[PDB]
Amino acid sequence: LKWIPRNLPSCLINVESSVTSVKLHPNLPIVFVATDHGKLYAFDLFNYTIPLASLQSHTKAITSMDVLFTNYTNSSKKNYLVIVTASKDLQIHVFKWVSEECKFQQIRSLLGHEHIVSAVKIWQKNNDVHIASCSRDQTVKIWDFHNGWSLKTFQPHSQWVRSIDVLGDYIISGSHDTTLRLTHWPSGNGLSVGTGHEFPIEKVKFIHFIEDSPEIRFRTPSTDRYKNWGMQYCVSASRDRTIKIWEIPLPTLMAHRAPIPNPTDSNFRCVLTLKGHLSWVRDISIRGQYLFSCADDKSVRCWDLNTGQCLHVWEKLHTGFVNCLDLDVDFDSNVTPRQMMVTGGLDCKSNVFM
Amino acid sequence: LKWIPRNLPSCLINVESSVTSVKLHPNLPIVFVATDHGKLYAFDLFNYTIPLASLQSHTKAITSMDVLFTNYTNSSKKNYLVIVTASKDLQIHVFKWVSEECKFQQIRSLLGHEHIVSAVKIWQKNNDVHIASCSRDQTVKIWDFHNGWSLKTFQPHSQWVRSIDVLGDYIISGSHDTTLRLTHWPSGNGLSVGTGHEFPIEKVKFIHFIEDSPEIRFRTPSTDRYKNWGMQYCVSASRDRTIKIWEIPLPTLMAHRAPIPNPTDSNFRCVLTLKGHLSWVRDISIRGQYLFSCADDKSVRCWDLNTGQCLHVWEKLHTGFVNCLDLDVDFDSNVTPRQMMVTGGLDCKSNVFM
Amino acid sequence: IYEIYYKAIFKLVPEFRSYTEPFARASVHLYNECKARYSTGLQSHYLFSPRELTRLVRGVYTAINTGPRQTLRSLIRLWAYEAWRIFADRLVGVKEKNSFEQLLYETVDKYLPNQDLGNISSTSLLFSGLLSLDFKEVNKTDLVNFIEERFKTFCDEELEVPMVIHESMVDHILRIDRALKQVQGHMMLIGASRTGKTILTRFVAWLNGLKIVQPKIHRHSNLSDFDMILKKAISDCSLKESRTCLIIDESNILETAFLERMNTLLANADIPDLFQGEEYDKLLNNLRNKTRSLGLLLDTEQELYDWFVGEIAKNLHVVFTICDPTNNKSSAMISSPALFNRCIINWMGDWDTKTMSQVANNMVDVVPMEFTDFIVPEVNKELVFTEPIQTIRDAVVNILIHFDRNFYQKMKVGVNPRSPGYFIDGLRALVKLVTAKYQDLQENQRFVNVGLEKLNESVSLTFEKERWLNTTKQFSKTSQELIGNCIISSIYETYFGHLNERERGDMLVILKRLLGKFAVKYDVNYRFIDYLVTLDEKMKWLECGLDKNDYFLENMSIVMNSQDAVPFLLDPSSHMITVISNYYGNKTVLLSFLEEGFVKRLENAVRFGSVVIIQDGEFFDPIISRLISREFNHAGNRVTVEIGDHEVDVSGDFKLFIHSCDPSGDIPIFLRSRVRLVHFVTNKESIETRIFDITLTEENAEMQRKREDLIKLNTEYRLKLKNLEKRLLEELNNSQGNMLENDELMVTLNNLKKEAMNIEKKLSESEEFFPQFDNLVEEYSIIGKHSVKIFS
């Protein structure tokens, strides 16, 4: 389908200060507004101003948030009941969502990163047992979600790590060194290195249930079926003022494990480069046929992933940096609820589109 | 939209002394409690009971609080960081509310009334160029809002002017002289004077977005196209132990510009008299179908505006006299959280109903 | 020649080719007009070289490379905006610039009269400082605000500074950005140090990610260490193939030989001996590996080394900053036309009064200058050249306009380059207090709010009402003069404690009668040296012998306990050697920050605890390194980024200031200008007092110390009243006139009946001792005054 989360803020949200990330609860039409207060707010998309939850606890600010979407029923059972966030206070804050439509209690507070934790991604692949995290320490860590343990640490980056994802048995991360690096969650064996940017990595993201992106760019580019079934896509928006559609199947961290190891461990693949505009991209939504991004320039953009053509620019949705978007995942039965985008930014506002 | 701001004190606000006026923030999940310390207290409607922003500046007692709400956008952008109060110590204070959810610093003292200032409103109507206020000195004053400059003074009431409203060009006021008044500010041409109370006026309120109220009761019996736009309605409750619904330009305080136009300076146009509770009325508030009022007998009544039938009584709001109540209005998209009545009184508390 | 330059341009934008030659002649005419009108005999910066015409074109031509289409107005916008961007910005004299604007204006009337001079030659507007040129423009005041927004992406232990970009400063910023675009964008910043300048070069380094290269050396070391730095810096340029950005403070020139190494670098992008012989060869080995990495044939030694200097050139962009050197280079280090015609020199110095209206504008917008019953603070005289003051922020604006204007001129301490970041430091001190003392005003009402929280219902008020009420209303009585006292402290924070009497007097003396015409109240004791220090603390200093008779040493009770920039603690007099070591006394030295850094000769000497400055006689070269001049301000390389605080963890009490005994001590020039010069001008009262101290050994020296202890003794009873407020917190709301029906009354004020007497006890003892001690010191003035004359 063509997802059209447009119209014009069905709900205008005036926030105490700025917003860093707004994402939808796995099952309910409520979102969690991650602010710089650091307060996490529970928010029914069809109501305002909601005092349901003003979860002050992120001592400094909310830098990361995950588990608001789920891909596996037995873990889902707890995922709709939990969330993993992280702050500038070096803690990875794991909470328990309850039937009250909010994170009633805290489950875990993880510490080991010393310079600011920049991003956390949960190993849903491990039934919500392992947690991937990264930070300004140039370091990537694995934690035990259900026990609060530091399970495994890796050193990939040369610079302060900016973003993170989970894919295969390896941990995806991007940083200020402009290079993406991916190491094996159990050993350090790599699954990607990307020297595909001039400037630092700002946003990474694995393809989901949307073969439309493969229809547009079948990958791998060399023998797609080599790993078409294993399409471990990723993307990497960066300070190049681009949104590059990436791939870890053939810029794999095989450190020349033959001579030129296929074409892995080099100048990163770059499936499709969406040349951006005059500012830095803050968020994206890989729709499949389309991509919905936003940037410091106050704009939200509809991109046609068929060559990466910005179909429409909405520079007036915010009056400050657009910090975040959340066009809810493809999912029939809730097409209108999924064709709904929430956003937040520098201007202390947040908006609900559809 | 319908509403149920009932149940029982969902939040019990704890103030060191008596509560005098409570102002819900229109867009944030917080509430401002004016007291007789004179101390304002922001309270967090989720994280309660917490005195989010205890504010000291008034040496005697705070009688009024405004600027959380507005009539002009560009100035309101600048005034969302502003809160304006009135006081028994003659202080009408302008507070620069800071994004930290606290009135960090005052930016203008508003002086002029030599006697207890019991109400202040701001003429946001002129691109927020002016300020309305009234007091025990039988006088109404206008300040240049942007500079705090007493630009216009009026003589309306013969007694303590208890309350004042902003109607663009007109000034609603009530007082101890049992005679409800209104003034055409641009010329100082009284637009009302109605001696309809037996006992001293305690509380008045300008008709807002409730033109369905005319379908319930309306004077003169017909023809709202004559001048409803100039025949500004209000409610005036008093020590009569009744609540009177009013139209006050029918009994205009004008220098009889023909004979007596309508009942100008004559038979006071009390639209509807309510009788239920047993004492001097301290507050009123029209939600639309219903009017929630309070009195010295501690009994709040959800008056069905349609002829005046109390739906429900809240003798349980406070153990002291109920000084005020604050109905949050439901609007499309922003509906469920608006099911709320925050009250306050002599028992030093401010209870939140929902 | 320039007809060729411009007819080329009008083949590129032939739609308005009709300008061609007269356009070229407008360029050359204005040039010769200004060359003749402003010769080098006026000043060297009026050296109108024919390559200034090429420079003029560089802005014009590179703009048409971005331009979408030309119009005659766009064309003259480009040219005449560029003309003052080049031909006027390259100059200093403002009246010469006014005539320039008219020479420009008239030049257009002479050759290109058809276009809009009114909105172009007469105003310093910028071509979209944050967008691609394209003959597009953006309001530069708005650009300042847009920068505020945009630098939030660099607001991370990088910028984060409470200072304002002057609208002339943003003109300077864009010019800097242009210089950054320039290959080998070498610069020379002339003017106010570390105040929208040195700070600004750091800003653009943070905003653009530029490698500030520093000469991390010491006078003990020599050119050899510079050579090392140059080897690793040039390795970054040519071997790592990365863009560097050498930042030079004129005090970095170790020696002429070093400068000569630099001169050849400037001439041939290389350094003799340093990158010759084996260094040449090892570079060729590394370089060919880098051109091999590039897949190029440049490996060939000659091409390789040419690549070395070519890669370097792309990666140099040396930004030099400067305050007039005393080594004859006050006439510019760039004495030669060879450097003059190649280095981008910013003749800034000071800023306009009009500019100060905009500086102050934003400076009063960024911080909460407004108050309650405070109406306005200026009584003296002068709202001239400005708008009549309607409120407090307006006052600061008017003040700044005439204040910075004359604070400072009168050539004693460099009449042409004043530093507004000091008025910002003064204002920043006003901000420290506009917040803190304002908050104290809320706390003040809170003091009586709290008292009120349990009056009526639980009191039998005597003194408590007197105190409660008097202070309750004194909060409004003090509604003017609080600022007046604060202003004076900011004057001293601005320049009284740094700038010499005449350069200072330019505003200071006249400020006493020319602050403005709109309220304030000064309040007799508005004295800076008392205003910012707690009496208990001041006594900790006086009890330790503080030379209070020297105004600027009495000041140390504040500065040592609250000083941002290093104070010049000159001690041949050993006034503060005596006092600092006494104040220190039983206190421990330095400790929070604990890592030894790079200067263990000092860190081993100071890392123990509470009080310390770089101690008695510890002169720069022997103790303080140039590494410290950097790390002193901040140091995330030792205070790990893991903490998050990249500033070195050093408090004021143990902040490493220097007890130099050399009046012309080795303070790095920017720090020499950014220093609280502490004056040890042993005042006549200090002369006779030090002599008193000698003569006090006759019998009663200890009496001096005893009274100071006793002054502090008087402060013991603040809690006899403050505890009442604490004990008057809860029962007001039960006030029914039954205050005598319970012991909530007596539990607080029956105690006061005796606590009030306690207030009198040790307090009065101190006072009984006071005159007794005074009579044992003053008696030596019979010869103390003689020693004053003897000292003269």
Coordinates of C-alpha atoms in Angstrom, one line a residue, chain B residues 144-309:
Chain B
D144 CA 0.2 48.4 28.7
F145 CA 1.1 44.7 28.9
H146 CA 4.3 44.9 27.0
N147 CA 5.6 47.6 29.4
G148 CA 3.4 47.3 32.5
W149 CA 2.0 50.8 32.1
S150 CA -1.4 51.7 33.7
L151 CA -2.8 53.3 30.5
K152 CA -6.5 53.5 31.4
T153 CA -8.6 53.9 34.6
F154 CA -12.3 53.5 35.1
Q155 CA -14.9 54.1 37.8
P156 CA -17.7 51.5 37.6
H157 CA -18.7 50.2 41.0
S158 CA -19.6 51.9 44.1
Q159 CA -18.1 49.1 46.2
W160 CA -15.2 46.6 46.2
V161 CA -14.8 45.4 42.6
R162 CA -14.6 41.7 43.3
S163 CA -14.0 40.4 39.7
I164 CA -13.1 41.4 36.2
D165 CA -13.2 40.0 32.6
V166 CA -11.5 40.6 29.2
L167 CA -14.1 41.1 26.4
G168 CA -12.0 42.8 23.7
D169 CA -13.4 46.2 24.1
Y170 CA -15.5 45.5 27.2
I171 CA -14.8 45.1 30.9
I172 CA -17.1 42.8 33.0
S173 CA -17.0 43.5 36.6
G174 CA -18.8 42.5 39.8
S175 CA -18.7 44.0 43.2
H176 CA -20.0 44.4 46.7
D177 CA -22.5 47.0 45.5
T178 CA -24.9 44.2 44.3
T179 CA -24.8 45.9 40.9
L180 CA -23.2 44.1 38.0
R181 CA -21.3 46.2 35.6
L182 CA -19.5 46.3 32.2
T183 CA -17.4 49.0 30.5
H184 CA -16.6 50.0 26.9
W185 CA -12.9 50.4 27.5
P186 CA -12.0 52.3 24.2
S187 CA -14.3 55.2 25.3
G188 CA -14.9 54.5 29.0
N189 CA -18.6 54.1 28.1
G190 CA -20.2 51.9 30.6
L191 CA -21.9 49.0 28.8
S192 CA -23.6 47.7 32.0
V193 CA -25.0 48.4 35.4
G194 CA -27.6 46.0 36.9
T195 CA -28.7 46.0 40.5
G196 CA -30.0 42.5 40.6
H197 CA -28.5 41.2 43.7
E198 CA -29.9 41.4 47.2
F199 CA -26.5 40.9 48.7
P200 CA -22.9 41.8 47.5
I201 CA -21.6 40.2 44.3
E202 CA -18.9 37.6 44.7
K203 CA -18.3 36.0 41.4
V204 CA -18.7 36.8 37.7
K205 CA -18.0 35.0 34.5
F206 CA -18.0 36.0 30.8
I207 CA -20.0 33.9 28.3
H208 CA -17.5 31.8 26.3
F209 CA -18.0 29.2 23.5
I210 CA -21.5 28.2 24.8
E211 CA -24.0 29.8 22.4
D212 CA -26.2 26.8 23.1
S213 CA -26.7 28.6 26.5
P214 CA -29.1 30.9 24.5
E215 CA -31.2 27.8 23.7
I216 CA -31.6 27.3 27.4
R217 CA -32.2 30.9 28.5
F218 CA -31.7 34.2 26.6
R219 CA -32.7 37.8 27.0
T220 CA -34.4 39.5 25.5
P221 CA -36.6 36.5 24.7
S222 CA -35.6 36.5 21.0
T223 CA -33.5 38.2 18.3
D224 CA -29.9 37.4 19.2
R225 CA -29.0 39.0 15.9
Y226 CA -30.0 42.3 17.3
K227 CA -26.8 42.5 19.3
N228 CA -25.8 39.3 21.0
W229 CA -22.3 40.3 19.8
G230 CA -22.6 43.4 22.0
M231 CA -25.1 42.1 24.5
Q232 CA -22.4 40.2 26.2
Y233 CA -23.5 37.6 28.7
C234 CA -22.1 36.7 32.0
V235 CA -22.9 34.9 35.2
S236 CA -23.0 36.7 38.5
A237 CA -23.1 34.8 41.6
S238 CA -23.3 36.4 45.0
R239 CA -24.0 36.5 48.7
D240 CA -27.7 36.0 47.7
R241 CA -27.0 32.3 48.1
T242 CA -28.1 32.1 44.5
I243 CA -26.3 32.1 41.2
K244 CA -27.7 34.4 38.7
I245 CA -27.2 34.1 35.0
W246 CA -27.0 37.5 33.3
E247 CA -27.1 39.7 30.3
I248 CA -25.6 42.9 31.2
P249 CA -25.8 45.2 28.2
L250 CA -29.5 45.1 28.3
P251 CA -29.0 47.1 31.5
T252 CA -26.3 49.3 30.0
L253 CA -24.3 51.9 32.1
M254 CA -24.4 54.4 29.2
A255 CA -25.4 58.0 29.2
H256 CA -28.9 57.1 27.8
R257 CA -28.1 57.7 24.1
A258 CA -31.8 57.9 23.0
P259 CA -34.3 57.0 25.9
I260 CA -33.6 53.8 27.7
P261 CA -32.3 51.3 25.1
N262 CA -33.6 48.0 26.2
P263 CA -33.5 48.3 30.0
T264 CA -30.4 50.5 30.1
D265 CA -29.6 51.5 33.7
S266 CA -33.0 50.0 34.6
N267 CA -34.5 46.6 35.4
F268 CA -31.5 44.4 35.8
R269 CA -31.5 41.5 33.3
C270 CA -31.0 38.5 35.4
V271 CA -31.4 35.7 32.9
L272 CA -31.8 32.8 35.4
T273 CA -31.6 32.5 39.2
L274 CA -30.3 29.3 40.6
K275 CA -31.1 28.1 44.1
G276 CA -29.7 24.9 45.7
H277 CA -26.7 25.1 47.9
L278 CA -27.0 27.1 51.2
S279 CA -24.5 29.9 51.1
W280 CA -22.4 32.7 49.6
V281 CA -21.2 31.6 46.2
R282 CA -17.4 31.5 45.7
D283 CA -17.1 30.0 42.2
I284 CA -19.0 29.1 39.1
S285 CA -17.9 27.4 35.9
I286 CA -19.9 26.6 32.8
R287 CA -18.8 23.5 30.9
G288 CA -21.8 24.0 28.6
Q289 CA -24.6 21.6 29.5
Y290 CA -23.6 22.0 33.1
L291 CA -22.4 24.8 35.4
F292 CA -20.2 23.7 38.4
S293 CA -20.5 26.2 41.3
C294 CA -19.2 26.3 44.8
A295 CA -20.2 28.1 48.0
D296 CA -19.4 28.6 51.7
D297 CA -21.6 25.6 52.5
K298 CA -18.8 23.5 50.9
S299 CA -21.3 22.0 48.4
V300 CA -20.4 22.1 44.7
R301 CA -23.3 21.6 42.3
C302 CA -23.2 20.5 38.7
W303 CA -26.0 22.7 37.7
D304 CA -27.8 21.5 34.6
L305 CA -27.7 24.8 32.7
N306 CA -30.9 23.7 31.2
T307 CA -33.2 25.5 33.8
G308 CA -30.8 25.0 36.7
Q309 CA -30.9 21.5 38.0

